[PDB]
Design an enzyme around this catalytic site. Structure first.
Site, PDB file in Angstrom:
ATOM      1  N   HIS A   1     -77.873  14.621   0.595  1.00  0.00           N
ATOM      2  CA  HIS A   1     -78.364  14.155   1.892  1.00  0.00           C
ATOM      3  C   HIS A   1     -79.833  13.720   1.777  1.00  0.00           C
ATOM      4  O   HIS A   1     -80.764  14.364   2.277  1.00  0.00           O
ATOM      5  CB  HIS A   1     -78.213  15.276   2.913  1.00  0.00           C
ATOM      6  CG  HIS A   1     -76.819  15.525   3.395  1.00  0.00           C
ATOM      7  ND1 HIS A   1     -75.690  15.458   2.605  1.00  0.00           N
ATOM      8  CD2 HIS A   1     -76.387  15.915   4.617  1.00  0.00           C
ATOM      9  CE1 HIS A   1     -74.630  15.785   3.326  1.00  0.00           C
ATOM     10  NE2 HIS A   1     -75.028  16.084   4.549  1.00  0.00           N
TER      11      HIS A   1
ATOM     12  N   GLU B   1     -74.016  10.654  14.932  1.00  0.00           N
ATOM     13  CA  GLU B   1     -73.951   9.369  14.255  1.00  0.00           C
ATOM     14  C   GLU B   1     -74.166   8.184  15.184  1.00  0.00           C
ATOM     15  O   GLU B   1     -74.510   7.096  14.711  1.00  0.00           O
ATOM     16  CB  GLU B   1     -72.638   9.247  13.453  1.00  0.00           C
ATOM     17  CG  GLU B   1     -72.643  10.318  12.344  1.00  0.00           C
ATOM     18  CD  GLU B   1     -71.368  10.458  11.564  1.00  0.00           C
ATOM     19  OE1 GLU B   1     -70.278  10.162  12.110  1.00  0.00           O
ATOM     20  OE2 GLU B   1     -71.469  10.896  10.391  1.00  0.00           O
TER      21      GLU B   1
ATOM     22  N   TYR C   1     -79.671  14.652  12.150  1.00  0.00           N
ATOM     23  CA  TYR C   1     -79.707  16.086  12.420  1.00  0.00           C
ATOM     24  C   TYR C   1     -81.004  16.368  13.161  1.00  0.00           C
ATOM     25  O   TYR C   1     -82.079  16.159  12.607  1.00  0.00           O
ATOM     26  CB  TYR C   1     -79.669  16.888  11.106  1.00  0.00           C
ATOM     27  CG  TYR C   1     -78.459  16.590  10.267  1.00  0.00           C
ATOM     28  CD1 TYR C   1     -77.260  17.278  10.453  1.00  0.00           C
ATOM     29  CD2 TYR C   1     -78.481  15.579   9.298  1.00  0.00           C
ATOM     30  CE1 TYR C   1     -76.140  16.985   9.723  1.00  0.00           C
ATOM     31  CE2 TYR C   1     -77.362  15.288   8.538  1.00  0.00           C
ATOM     32  CZ  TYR C   1     -76.186  15.998   8.755  1.00  0.00           C
ATOM     33  OH  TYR C   1     -75.016  15.704   8.054  1.00  0.00           O
TER      34      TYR C   1
ATOM     35  N   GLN D   1     -76.618   9.823   9.222  1.00  0.00           N
ATOM     36  CA  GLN D   1     -76.333  11.122   9.826  1.00  0.00           C
ATOM     37  C   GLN D   1     -77.630  11.714  10.348  1.00  0.00           C
ATOM     38  O   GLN D   1     -78.549  11.971   9.573  1.00  0.00           O
ATOM     39  CB  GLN D   1     -75.702  12.034   8.787  1.00  0.00           C
ATOM     40  CG  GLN D   1     -74.331  11.569   8.375  1.00  0.00           C
ATOM     41  CD  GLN D   1     -73.708  12.416   7.298  1.00  0.00           C
ATOM     42  OE1 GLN D   1     -74.268  13.421   6.848  1.00  0.00           O
ATOM     43  NE2 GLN D   1     -72.533  12.000   6.854  1.00  0.00           N
TER      44      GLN D   1
ATOM     45  N   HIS E   1     -76.959   9.067   2.633  1.00  0.00           N
ATOM     46  CA  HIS E   1     -76.039   8.871   1.523  1.00  0.00           C
ATOM     47  C   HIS E   1     -74.769   8.123   1.904  1.00  0.00           C
ATOM     48  O   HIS E   1     -74.092   7.592   1.014  1.00  0.00           O
ATOM     49  CB  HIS E   1     -75.681  10.220   0.932  1.00  0.00           C
ATOM     50  CG  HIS E   1     -75.063  11.140   1.929  1.00  0.00           C
ATOM     51  ND1 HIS E   1     -75.781  11.710   2.958  1.00  0.00           N
ATOM     52  CD2 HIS E   1     -73.779  11.540   2.086  1.00  0.00           C
ATOM     53  CE1 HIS E   1     -74.957  12.420   3.705  1.00  0.00           C
ATOM     54  NE2 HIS E   1     -73.740  12.342   3.194  1.00  0.00           N
TER      55      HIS E   1
ATOM     56  N   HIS F   1     -75.506  18.380   6.523  1.00  0.00           N
ATOM     57  CA  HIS F   1     -75.138  19.438   7.455  1.00  0.00           C
ATOM     58  C   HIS F   1     -76.206  20.525   7.406  1.00  0.00           C
ATOM     59  O   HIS F   1     -76.412  21.167   6.387  1.00  0.00           O
ATOM     60  CB  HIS F   1     -73.744  19.952   7.139  1.00  0.00           C
ATOM     61  CG  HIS F   1     -72.664  19.011   7.550  1.00  0.00           C
ATOM     62  ND1 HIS F   1     -72.595  17.704   7.110  1.00  0.00           N
ATOM     63  CD2 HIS F   1     -71.611  19.191   8.377  1.00  0.00           C
ATOM     64  CE1 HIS F   1     -71.544  17.122   7.664  1.00  0.00           C
ATOM     65  NE2 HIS F   1     -70.939  18.000   8.442  1.00  0.00           N
TER      66      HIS F   1
HETATM   67  O1  LIG Z   1     -72.852  15.385   6.008  1.00  0.00           O
HETATM   68  O2  LIG Z   1     -72.163  14.480   5.122  1.00  0.00           O
HETATM   69 CU   LIG Z   2     -73.948  16.941   5.957  1.00  0.00          CU
END
Ligand SMILES: [O-][O-]
Ligand SMILES: [Cu+2]
Ligand SMILES: *[C@@H]1O[C@H](CO)[C@@H](O[C@@H]2O[C@H](CO)[C@@H](O)[C@H](O)[C@H]2NC(C)=O)[C@H](O)[C@H]1NC(C)=O
Length: 223
Positions: free
Chosen positions: A84, A30, A168, A166, A157, A1
């Site tokens: 992460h 995702e 970002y 994930q 992870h 995050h």
């Molecule tokens: O962002 O688990």
């Molecule tokens: Cu996160």
């Protein structure tokens, strides 16, 4: 995050959400097939910005990653949780009007990546432990003019199955000055460049521990 919430150019931070299209929330995308994989988006919301940042071709810009828009520090937890682990990546896309172009579709070319080094350290760990700084060289040889810059961290992870990785990312708005146009990149699409089956997307980073990592997407463009 985490959020790429401001860009440093010529050694000067350009401001929070100034020339960077920032989401309100720090959660990941995702679904690599979604339009949101290009410049973030639904189910998040992304703000528009009227600023287009001038940058000299050949120089570096630095994406500044932070946990939340309001974060005021630069310690590891102020950047992204240490669980992460994954690559950092950056792409450019030539556009007509960087303040409005959506970034979805073809035209992206990769200009930086940092996966896992020969010591087993991940690109995200260099950002987390480097005050959120993700330095990116703008090639000297590309055409001048308006571009989007997509900077990304992928956390792996929870990526043993897909969906799980994930993504970002945020897009900054650039005016590249001094590019020579000596080289025309081959390009890829977002969505399209990543697949849920990619070896760098579906991956179990602890079972067994990996010692090599293949960053998703095309090779890095070089002059
Ligand atoms: O962002 O688990
Ligand atoms: Cu996160
Ligand atoms: C400018 O950005 C580039 C990446 O786009 C940085 O180059 C990397 O720097 C690291 C750290 O020294 C090296 O381990 C890599 O081998 C470099 N990659 C390439 C392709 O050269 C460069 O350091 C950045 N400059 C600044 C001031 O941050």
């Amino acid at each position: 995050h985490t959020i790429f919430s401001s860009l440093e150019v010529n050694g000067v931070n350009q401001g929070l959400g100034e020339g960077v299209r920032v989401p309100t929330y720090n959660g990941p995308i995702e679904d690599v097939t979604s339009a949101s994989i290009a410049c973030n988006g639904s189910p998040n919301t992304v703000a528009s910005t009227s600023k287009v940042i001038t940058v000299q071709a050949g120089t570096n810009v630095t994406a500044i990653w932070r946990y939340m828009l309001s974060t005021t520090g630069d310690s590891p937890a102020d950047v992204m949780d240490s669980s992460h682990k994954g690559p950092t990546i950056a792409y450019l896309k030539k556009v007509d009007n960087a303040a409005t172009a959506s970034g979805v579709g073809n035209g992206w070319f990769k200009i930086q990546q940092d996966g896992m080094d020969s010591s087993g350290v991940w690109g995200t760990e260099r950002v987390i432990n480097g005050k959120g700084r993700h330095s990116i060289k703008i090639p000297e040889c590309i055409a001048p003019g308006q571009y989007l810059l997509r900077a990304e961290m992928i956390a792996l992870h929870a990526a043993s199955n897909y969906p799980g990785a994930q993504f970002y990312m945020e897009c900054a708005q650039l005016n590249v000055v001094g590019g020579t146009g000596a080289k025309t990149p081959s390009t890829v699409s977002f969505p399209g460049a990543y697949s849920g089956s990619d070896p760098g997307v579906k991956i179990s980073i602890y079972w067994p521990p990996v010692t090599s990592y293949t960053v998703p997407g095309p090779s890095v463009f070089t002059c």
